[PDB]
From a paper:
While the full length OsmC esterases were recalcitrant to our attempts at structure determination, the putative esterase from Rhodothermus marinus, EstRM, was crystallised as a C-terminal truncation comprising residues 1–255 of the 410 amino acid full-length protein, including the alpha-beta-hydrolase domain, with a C-terminal hexa-histidine tag. The structure was determined by molecular replacement to 1.56 Å resolution. The structure consists of two molecules in the asymmetric unit, which align with an rmsd of 0.35 Å in their Cα positions over 225 residues and can thus be considered identical in their overall fold. Molecule A has visible electron density for residues 1–70, 82–150, and 153–253; while molecule B has visible electron density for residues 2–70, 84–148, 156–168, 175–253. ΔEstRM has a classical α/β-hydrolase fold, with a core β-sheet made up of seven parallel strands (β1, β3–6, β10–11) and one antiparallel strand (β2); one face of the protein is flanked by two alpha helices (α1 and 8) and the other by four helices (α2, 3, 6, 7). There is an insertion in the α/β hydrolase fold between β6 and α6, which is formed by α4, β7, β8, β9, and α5, encompassing residues 136–180. The inserted domain between β6 and α6 forms a lid that completely occludes the active site, with a loop formed by residues 160–165 sitting directly above S109. The differences seen between the two chains in the asymmetric unit and high B-factors indicate that the lid region is likely to be flexible and may act to modulate the accessibility of the active site. The structure of ΔEstRM has a partially occupied intra-molecular disulphide bond between residues C135 and C210. This disulphide links α7 with the loop preceding α4, stabilising the position of the beginning of the insertion domain.
Numbering used by the authors: 1 to 70, 82 to 150, 153 to 253
Amino acid sequence: MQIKTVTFENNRGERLAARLDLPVDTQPVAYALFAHCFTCSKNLKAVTTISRALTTQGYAVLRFDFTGLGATNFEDLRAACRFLSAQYEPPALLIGHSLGGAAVLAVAGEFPEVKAVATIGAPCDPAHVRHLLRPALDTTVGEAVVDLGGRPFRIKKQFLEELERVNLEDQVRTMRRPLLLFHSPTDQIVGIENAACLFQAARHPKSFVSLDQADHLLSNSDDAAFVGEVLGAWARRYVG
């Protein structure tokens, strides 16, 4: 594995940063976009453990920090996908954790080259997102403060507005791509009922893997390794 810092712009010319994790394979089996909220934790051990499991299997992984902790919206995720399409290969796998999971599910259908989608702890609807969010104080307008049980962060109000308008369950039903949902039954932030909701909305192929006693932010790195290894093995059926 080699890790690189990358930079790219969105359609407003704003500069975004990400980390690109490359495998030993000169040609990766696939490039994955991984939109996540693990930056809410005390460290990045969860996301680097997942990413390392994927690079071990030959994937390249673009880690996109959805929290902005180092304000996000759908266009920033699209910008990351365009960056991969231009400078690498269009991503064949989308991965989303927490709010990032809701985001990748809502945009996956926009990208024909995406062959598989996987999420971790994703909420299924606006009511369960509202549980996590409150309006931020205006000065910079139109943002919200998110609480996932760790470091809080800001996002654009446009995110929930757009998510509510496109309807996540409709998007999942019409995605026409294989889906893998990970969720902990003991998740205190986004309840396990959200995974059942998403699974019922989806069409086959659809899959679900239980994270047993894991927490929302995967603070046990054994759980993060598990997610990465299973995800990589599963997606290989579809990406090549």
